[PDB]
Design a protein around this ligand. Structure first.
Ligand SMILES: O=C(NO)c1cccc(O)c1
Ligand SMILES: O=C(NO)c1cccc(O)c1
Ligand SMILES: O=C(NO)c1cccc(O)c1
Ligand SMILES: O=C(NO)c1cccc(O)c1
Ligand SMILES: [Fe+2]
Ligand SMILES: [Fe+2]
Lengths: 332, 332
C-alpha cells in the first residue's frame, strides 16, 4: 500500500492506478544496502528492493527536457504497441514460424522527434503507447556521459565480485508512458533494475512456476515469454495458471530491484503517473560447479533438450511431434 | 496359408494352430539367397525369408535325444513362464523400479534335467512353459561343435562384409515348447533368425510404428518391449494400437528370417507342433555417416534423450515429470 513522500506531498501512488489480475501476490522486502538480510537474499537468489544504493544518483534529475537538451542528436530505437501490451519478438527466429506476423515494431528517430510524437499521443487520447531503449555509452551526449560516470560503480563492481558473477554484459535505459505493460518473461542473466523517474509495478514469479506459466517453445520468436494473457487467461489450455502466486512491489526513484536470473517478471507503469525512466544492469551468473537440482537448472536442461532436438532433427517444427511421441502412453 | 512338405506328407501346419489378434498383417516375401530381390530387401533394411542358405544345414538332425546324447554335461539356462507369455527383464534395471517384481525366472540345469522337466509338463497338461538358451561355443560337447563348424560361415561372413556391418556379436540357440510366445520387442542389432526344428510364427512391425506400440521407458527393466498386451489390448491407454499393421510369416526348418535392426518382432511357437529349435545370429549395424531422417534414427534419439535426462537429473524417476512439464500447453 502507497508510500508517503517527504515534505507532506501525499501518497506516491494509490491502488486505483494498479491493474487487476487473477492471482494472489505477496511483497518483496525493501531493505538497506547495509542490512545483512539484503546480502542474504541476493546470495540465495531471491529478489529484494535496495532503497539507498545511490546507484543512479545523478540521473534523478533526468526528465524529457533535460534529456532533449543534453542527450545529443544520435538516433534512438523507439518501440510502439497499439494496446498497452508490448509484444516483443526475436527477428532471427521468424524463419522457423511463418504464421508469426510482427505485432509491435521499432522506429528510429532523433530524441526530440520521439518527444514530439509522445506528447502528441497524450493530449489526444491516442491508444498508442511507446517505449524508448538505449544502451548507455560514449555514443551519447557529453553531460549524459558525466551523469553515467557518476553512477555508483563502486557499489556495482563490489556486487559483481562478491557473488562471483561475470562482468556487466550490458545496461539499458528505458523511458515509458503510463499504462505500459511488458508481459511476463524471464532472462538468463542476473538483473539490477534501477528506477529513476516515475513508479513501476513489478510482479515476479520464481523459476519453479515454469509449469504455471507456459513459455513459448524455444524456437518461437517469443521464447522466454509466457503464453498466458494475464488480462484474459485461458484456463482450458493453461489450467495451472490458476495456481500461480507472485511476488510484487512498486519501485520508485532511487530504488533498485534485484531480479534474480530465471525469475519471471511482469513490469507495468502505473495508470496515470506520467512517464517512467529506468536503467537495468545485467551480469552473467557464476558458472556451475552436485545435487539435488535447483529449479533454474532444470529449466536450462529443458531449453537444451529443445535446442538439441531442433538440430538433430534438422527442423524446429519436428520438435513437438517427437516429444509427444516420446511421451504418450509411456510417461503420461 | 500352410506349406506342403515333400513326399505327400500333408500341410506343414494349419491355421487352427495360429493365435488370433486384433490387427491386420501381410506376408513377408520368401525368396532364394540368389534372387536379386532378396539382396535388395536386406539392403533397404526390410525383412525377407531366405529359403536355401544352408546356414544351419548340419543342425537339421538336432532333436532332444541327439542333443542329450551329445551336448555334454555343462549347465544350461532354462527360463520358465506360468502362462504362454515369457516376460523378460533386465536385472540391472530393477533398482530404478522397486514395484517391479520378477514374473518369469531362470533356472540352471544339466540338459537331461531340462529334458526330464519338459516331458513331465507335457503329458500332465501343465500350464508351465519353458525356453532353453545357450550361446554356441567351444564350451559345448564335441559333436555339437562339429555341427556348429559346418554352418555356412562363408554365406554368413559374405553378408557381414557386403552390408558393411560390424562383426558377429553373438549367437544363441533357443529350444521351445508349443504354445510359447515371446512378446513384441525390438533389438538395436541386425538379426538372422535360422529355424532348425518345428515352425515359428513371426510378426514384425517396422520402426515407424513406435507410436502404436508403446515401449516401456528406457530405465524400466522391460526396456524395448511393448506395453500392449496383444491378447487383451487396452485401447484407452494405448489408443493407437488400433492402427497397428504387421508383417508376418511362418518359418520352418532351413528357413532364415532377416529381422532388420529396430524392427519390432513378436515370436510364437504354433499351438501343438511339438518343440522348436532356432539359432539367431546378431551383428552390429554399419555406423552412421545427412538427411532427412529414418524412423530408426529418430528412435535412437528418443532413447538418448531419456538416457541423458536420467543422468542429468540424478534419478530415473524424475524423467517423466520433466518431460510432461516440458511438454504441456507448450507442444501439445
Ligand atoms: O523487462 C525488463 N527488465 O528486465 C523491463 C524493465 C523496465 C521496464 C520494462 O517494461 C521492462
Ligand atoms: O527484459 C529482458 N530481460 O529480463 C531482456 C532480455 C533480452 C534483451 C533485453 O533487452 C531485455
Ligand atoms: O526374440 C527372438 N529373436 O530376436 C526370438 C527367437 C526365437 C524364439 C523366440 O521366442 C524369440
Ligand atoms: O530377442 C532379442 N532381440 O531381438 C534379444 C535382445 C537382447 C538379448 C537377447 O538374448 C535377445
Ligand atoms: Fe526483463
Ligand atoms: Fe528378439
Amino acid at each position: 500500500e502507497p508510500r508517503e513522500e517527504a515534505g507532506a506531498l501525499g501518497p506516491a501512488w494509490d491502488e486505483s492506478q494498479l491493474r487487476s489480475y487473477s492471482f494472489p501476490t505477496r511483497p518483496i522486502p525493501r531493505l538497506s544496502q547495509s542490512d545483512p538480510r539484503a546480502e542474504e537474499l541476493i546470495e540465495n537468489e531471491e529478489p529484494v528492493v535496495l532503497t539507498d544504493t545511490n546507484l543512479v544518483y545523478p540521473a534523478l534529475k533526468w526528465d524529457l527536457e533535460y534529456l532533449q537538451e543534453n542527450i545529443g542528436n544520435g538516433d534512438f530505437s523507439v518501440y510502439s504497441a497499439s494496446t498497452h501490451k508490448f509484444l516483443y519478438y526475436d527477428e532471427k527466429k521468424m524463419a522457423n514460424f511463418q504464421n508469426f506476423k510482427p505485432r509491435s515494431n521499432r522506429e528510429e528517430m532523433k530524441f526530440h522527434e520521439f518527444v514530439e510524437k509522445l506528447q502528441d499521443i497524450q493530449q489526444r487520447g491516442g491508444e498508442e503507447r511507446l517505449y524508448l531503449q538505449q544502451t548507455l555509452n560514449d555514443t551519447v551526449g557529453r553531460k549524459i556521459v558525466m551523469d553515467f560516470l557518476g553512477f555508483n560503480w563502486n557499489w556495482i563492481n563490489k556486487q559483481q565480485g562478491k557473488r562471483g558473477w561475470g562482468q556487466l554484459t550490458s545496461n539499458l535505459l528505458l523511458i515509458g508512458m503510463e499504462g505500459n505493460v511488458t508481459p511476463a518473461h524471464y532472462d538468463e542473466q542476473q538483473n539490477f533494475f534501477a528506477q529513476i523517474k516515475g513508479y513501476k509495478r513489478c510482479i515476479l514469479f520464481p523459476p519453479d512456476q515454469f509449469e504455471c506459466l507456459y513459455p513459448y517453445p524455444v524456437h518461437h520468436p517469443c521464447d522466454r515469454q509466457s503464453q498466458v494473457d494475464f488480462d484474459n487467461p485461458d484456463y482450458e489450455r493453461f489450467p495451472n495458471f490458476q495456481n500461480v502466486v507472485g511476488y510484487e512491489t512498486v519501485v520508485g526513484p532511487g530504488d533498485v530491484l534485484y531480479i534474480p536470473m530465471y525469475w519471471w517478471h511482469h513490469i507495468e507503469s502505473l495508470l496515470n503517473g506520467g512517464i517512467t525512466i529506468t536503467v537495468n544492469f545485467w551480469y552473467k551468473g557464476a558458472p556451475t560447479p552436485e545435487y539435488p537440482l535447483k529449479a533454474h537448472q532444470k529449466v536450462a536442461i529443458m531449453r537444451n533438450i529443445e535446442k538439441m532436438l531442433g538440430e538433430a532433427l534438422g527442423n524446429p517444427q519436428e520438435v513437438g511431434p517427437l516429444l509427444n511421441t516420446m511421451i504418450k502412453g509411456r510417461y503420461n
